[PDB]
């Protein structure tokens, strides 16, 4: 993961998902773009 | 000096009530039950004499906790030793010791020597049955 307070897409395939009181960025394009807010 | 009834210790007749707890939250059960045990809703106060009643509480396993607080109202105890907080409980006490959830009414009363007498008129049973059927209790509806 990368846990940052600020979260943006990185690629064309980044999709923003809320799972709990949180914001995700999930990519099948790379595993390098996993992102948390925290 | 004039005329108001300062009631005496052996004049007040007491009663026995049954109060269900099927899907009512903690605050409002405890509110009505704690207003009962001081002898309110009777015109014969003193602020001395135990003019209260007797409350029996049935189905303590089925008390609502609204929204969250199921995993959240962490109670706390400390035991006078260093490093001694024990936050063991949660909303777990609905399952184990549903009698103990005898804290949210023990808070609601004064902490005199009448808030220790009037606490010993609760009989909170987690199941659905009296052992006290020999004393002929009555039922209270709650639209309160």
């Amino acid at each position: 993961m990368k846990v940052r307070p600020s979260v943006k897409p990185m690629c064309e395939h980044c999709k923003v998902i809320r799972r709990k009181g949180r914001v995700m960025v999930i990519c099948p394009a790379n595993p390098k773009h996993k992102q948390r807010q925290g | 000096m004039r005329t108001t009834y300062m009631a005496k210790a052996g004049e007040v007749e007491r009663k026995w009530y049954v109060v269900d707890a099927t899907d009512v939250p903690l605050g409002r059960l405890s509110a009505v039950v704690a207003s009962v045990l001081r002898g309110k809703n009777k015109p014969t106060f003193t602020p001395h004499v135990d003019t209260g009643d007797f409350v029996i509480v049935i189905n303590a396993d089925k008390v609502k906790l609204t929204g969250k607080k199921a995993t959240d109202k962490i109670y706390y105890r400390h035991s006078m030793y260093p490093g001694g907080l024990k936050s063991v409980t949660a909303g777990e006490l609905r399952d184990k010791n549903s009698r103990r959830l005898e804290t949210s009414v023990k808070g609601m009363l004064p902490k005199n020597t009448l808030g220790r007498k009037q606490f010993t008129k609760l009989n909170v049973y987690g199941g659905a049955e009296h052992p006290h059927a020999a004393q002929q209790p009555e039922v209270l509806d709650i639209t309160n």
């Binding site: - | 009834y5 809703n41 015109p43 106060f45």
Partner: protein, 59 residues
Amino acid sequence: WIARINAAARMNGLSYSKLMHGLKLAEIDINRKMLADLAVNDAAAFTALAEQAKDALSK
């Protein structure tokens, strides 16, 4: 005397304050000491007063 009036007023369905508004519309002005003694002893007279206070604010 307010607490005793509240108890014996809730015994007749009236809330703890609407006796006051109801009696002051019906022009009845008892001290609350005497309402306390009647609310303890004279249940018939207290129900009479409570029914006139029901009668006043039933407009």
